[PDB]
């Protein structure tokens, strides 16, 4: 009953605009929201009939005809990462038709880039080390000896976003990340 | 004050029966079983409105069959479980039509409990742990210091990873895989490897007396599942890789 785009990505630190479809909607029926982090439950967000919705949780802004809802996020941050549920419910029951939902990605804009393939040696080993790729701009797509996707952390007391992706074999780093397009200014120590 | 699922992961052999258990919050009436696949939404399983199941529309097949006795605890039993069985088991609970002032009518989910089938159990392997230390021309580049932690030859993919600061855990400056790579790509049923990355400042890395640990929660066979190789029994259990601070 409800038609959301399988897949989007949204930019970090801005409200996060997530549109849903549902034009067949009665008069009686309510929209939800619910969200899915990885390896948890939905949980519900917010829900609204006609007007206009606001929590500490997120907005929700349905038109007038009723057909199209839109879910805002005030504040877009990693931890928002997630499957977002759009469904639609007649009045008297309980019963929860999911659809696909959608999978927000929370992308940040690196103002610093400083790309660069690090070698980490095991707290206990010999011939034993990955290879960090680092601090490349999210422009930046890895191609999969054993390659991780990329991976956004956020530390945030310091205000600071980076990307990485991990490389190891049982080699050696500076032709570790070579076979997709690092930026030509990496930092090869 | 939630819903609780046990057990959180289950290991089935084919053919063998499994039981899921569901504690909805305490007073609700309403009680929902749903089956949820890789990428994609929960599907209806079947429905209870206290002890009598109303709607059982969605059950796949006559091998699944659910219980709630006593209008509260729910039981979901898959009998001689199938490969295709395999899927996160979530349960929600609600409290009826307008019960109650600011009744936002909202579905209450369980952590769900995923259920994994494998044709033998021989292939349960439990994760190694490794940390590697940040890189000292890191450290002098950026003022940043990566740990890397690895989880490596671990099957089925029934693994929670966390970092964890002087006995606390921590969530700032860190990024987990969202799923793991196969180490054996041309191999069915073959064991994964995860990585995730703890960031702090080199100040704090510097700091001997500061602990560092990867955790890696495994879930493998319970205690009624037989073991006969001669290698430790894969059990749900715990496998860290610890690191203190180096100073320069
Ligand atoms: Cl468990
Ligand atoms: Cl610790
Ligand atoms: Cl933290
Ligand atoms: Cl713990
Ligand atoms: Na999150
Ligand atoms: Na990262």
């Known amino acids: 009953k409800t038609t959301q785009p399988p897949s989007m990505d949204c930019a970090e630190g801005r409200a996060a605009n997530l549109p849903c479809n549902h034009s067949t909607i009665s008069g009686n029926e309510y929209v939800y929201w619910y969200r899915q982090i990885h390896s948890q439950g939905p949980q519900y967000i917010i829900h609204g009939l006609k007007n206009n919705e606001t929590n500490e949780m997120a907005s929700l802004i349905i038109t007038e005809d009723r057909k199209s809802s839109t879910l805002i996020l005030p504040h877009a941050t990693l931890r928002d990462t997630a499957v977002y549920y759009c469904?639609?419910?007649?009045?008297?029951?309980?019963?929860?038709?999911f659809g696909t939902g959608t999978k927000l990605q929370v992308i940040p804009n690196i103002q610093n880039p400083d790309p660069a393939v690090y070698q980490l040696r095991d707290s206990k080993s010999s011939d034993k080390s990955v290879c960090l790729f680092t601090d490349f701009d999210s422009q930046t797509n890895v191609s999969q000896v054993y390659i991780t996707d990329k991976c956004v952390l956020d530390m945030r007391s310091m205000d600071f976003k980076s990307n990485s992706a991990v490389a190891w074999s049982n080699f050696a780093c500076a032709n570790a990340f070579n076979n997709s397009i690092i930026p030509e200014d990496t930092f090869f120590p | 004050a939630g819903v609780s699922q046990s057990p959180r992961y289950k290991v089935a052999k084919r053919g063998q029966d499994v039981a899921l258990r569901c504690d909805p919050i305490?007073?609700?009436?309403?009680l929902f079983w749903y089956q949820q696949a890789l990428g994609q939404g929960p599907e209806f399983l079947t429905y209870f409105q206290n002890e009598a199941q109303l709607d059982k529309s969605g059950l796949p097949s006559d091998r699944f069959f659910a219980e709630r006795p006593e209008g509260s605890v729910s039981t979901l039993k898959i009998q001689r479980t199938q490969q295709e069985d395999s899927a996160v088991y979530l349960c929600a609970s609600s409290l009826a039509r307008a019960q109650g002032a600011s009744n936002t009518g909202e579905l209450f989910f369980g952590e769900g409990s995923r259920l994994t089938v494998l044709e033998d159990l021989k292939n349960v392997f439990p994760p190694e742990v490794a940390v590697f230390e940040p890189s000292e021309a890191e450290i002098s580049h950026t003022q940043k210091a990566t740990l890397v932690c690895l989880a490596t030859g671990f099957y089925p993919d029934h693994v929670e990873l966390s970092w964890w600061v002087n006995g606390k855990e921590v969530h700032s400056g860190v990024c987990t895989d969202p799923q793991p790579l196969k180490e054996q790509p041309a191999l069915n049923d073959s064991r994964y490897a995860l990585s995730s990355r703890l960031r702090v400042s080199a100040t704090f890395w510097q700091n001997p007396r500061n602990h560092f640990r990867c955790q890696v929660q495994f879930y493998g066979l319970s205690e009624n599942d037989e073991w006969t190789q001669d290698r430790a029994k894969p059990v749900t259990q715990i496998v860290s890789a610890e690191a203190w601070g180096r100073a320069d």
């Open positions: 305490s007073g609700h009436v309403s």
């Open positions: 469904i639609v419910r007649v009045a008297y029951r309980q019963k929860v038709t």
